[PDB]
Amino acid sequence: HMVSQETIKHVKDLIAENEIFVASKTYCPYCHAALNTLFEKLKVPRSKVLVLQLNDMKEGADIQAALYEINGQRTVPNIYINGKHIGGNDDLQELRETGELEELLEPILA
Numbered sequence: 001h002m003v004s005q006e007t008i009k010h011v012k013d014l015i016a017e018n019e020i021f022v023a024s025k026t027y028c029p030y031c032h033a034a035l036n037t038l039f040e041k042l043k044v045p046r047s048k049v050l051v052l053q054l055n056d057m058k059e060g061a062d063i064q065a066a067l068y069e070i071n072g073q074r075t076v077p078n079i080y081i082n083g084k085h086i087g088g089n090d091d092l093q094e095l096r097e098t099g100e101l102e103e104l105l106e107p108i109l110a
Helices: 005-017 029-041 060-071 089-098 100-109
Strands: 020-024 049-053 078-081 084-087
Touching: 005 060, 020 029, 020 060, 029 049, 029 089, 078 100, 084 089, 089 100
Parallel strands: 020 049
Antiparallel strands: 020 078, 078 084
8 A cells, every 4th residue: 555546546547548558668678579569560559559658757656556556567568458457568478379469459449
């Protein structure tokens, strides 16, 4: 219970309001891997995805701490698709490999 309810609600809002939400950082190899998969490989429209660079926001550490409380993950990339917690790049690639990611992205690509 490290973070304010204000921050928890704000992060929950970002998760709910955006088709895809990706918590990221600048110069983050695995963040780059996940975004390259989404935008370049799978051609998800960039305008449908909210990407935040935590290290460059005042509220950055606060947002990261909120995500830890919400989903138990402490690292970036931290991905949500259609309100559902995906995880990091490992998780995204695993869903891709089974064919699940295709079905998760379908309603969004429409």
